[PDB]
Amino acid sequence: GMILKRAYDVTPQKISTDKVRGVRKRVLIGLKDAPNFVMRLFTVEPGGLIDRASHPWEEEIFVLKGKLTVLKEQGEETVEEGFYIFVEPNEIHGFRNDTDSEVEFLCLIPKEGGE
Amino acid sequence: GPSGMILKRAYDVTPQKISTDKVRGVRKRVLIGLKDAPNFVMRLFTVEPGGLIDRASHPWEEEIFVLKGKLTVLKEQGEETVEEGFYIFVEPNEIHGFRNDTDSEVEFLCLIPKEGGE
Numbered sequence: 252g253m254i255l256k257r258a259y260d261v262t263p264q265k266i267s268t269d270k271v272r273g274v275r276k277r278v279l280i281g282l283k284d285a286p287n288f289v290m291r292l293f294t295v296e297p298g299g300l301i302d303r304a305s306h307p308w309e310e311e312i313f314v315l316k317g318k319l320t321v322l323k324e325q326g327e328e329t330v331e332e333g334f335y336i337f338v339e340p341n342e343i344h345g346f347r348n349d350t351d352s353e354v355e356f357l358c359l360i361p362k363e364g365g366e
Numbered sequence: 367g368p369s370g371m372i373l374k375r376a377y378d379v380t381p382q383k384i385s386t387d388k389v390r391g392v393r394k395r396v397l398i399g400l401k402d403a404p405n406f407v408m409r410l411f412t413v414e415p416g417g418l419i420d421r422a423s424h425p426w427e428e429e430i431f432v433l434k435g436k437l438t439v440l441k442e443q444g445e446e447t448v449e450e451g452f453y454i455f456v457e458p459n460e461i462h463g464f465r466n467d468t469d470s471e472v473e474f475l476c477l478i479p480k481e482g483g484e
């Protein structure tokens with residue numbers, strides 16, 4: 252009834268699609284465990300990109316490492332470690348890493364969005 | 367609901383001192399709270415040196431990510447200390463608590479379904 256684990260030890264999944272490149276995703280608390288919302292840890296390699304998209308659920312993010320470029324419906328904004336982000340349902344968003352080192356952020360979504 | 371995206375330095379949020387029968391030496395920042403969240407809330411807890419969130423249980427789950435320091439986790443049986451970069455999943459009704467046995471502040475993110483408050 253209590254899981255305690257080092258996030259780094261969760262095997263990351265490489266994501267490479269027409270919309271996502273240079274990203275790896277760790278599912279920390281996924282559908283097997285979560286009654287309501289899931290916890291993922293994304294690592295964005297230098298030059299990695301999560302292109303703009305939207306979805307019917309909200310997203311809650313905490314920036315763990317580095318300088319994250321946040322794509323908005325209009326323009327972009329760069330945030331750093333120690334920022335949180337709340338993405339309303341349906342809001343256009345994406346992410347890019349313009350720096351020379353890896354960026355990490357924690358991403359939580361309601362379980363309807365999958366893990 | 368509303369549109370948009372909030373992007374904010376967590377330390378810009380005004381902490382609240384927590385003091386209850388079972389909690390001493392703790393402050394909390396509500397990052398994404400009831401006034402905005404459709405489903406679950408995001409808090410940043412700071413445990414001062416010596417601070418204690420004593421063993422308890424509640425009828426919602428908790429999801430934690432340790433941001434800073436060495437967090438002692440109190441379990442139904444015994445305890446375990448974890449560090450920055452660990453996550454914790456606490457099932458509904460599972461006994462849990464936390465202590466800071468170190469001389470510097472420990473920080474962790476804590477998310478709960480909004481039915482449990484903020």
Ligand SMILES: [Cu+2]
Binds near residue numbers: 460
């Ligand atoms: Cu149990």
Ligand SMILES: [Cu+2]
Binds near residue numbers: 304306310344
């Ligand atoms: Cu998204």
Ligand SMILES: [Cu+2]
Binds near residue numbers: 428
């Ligand atoms: Cu609790």
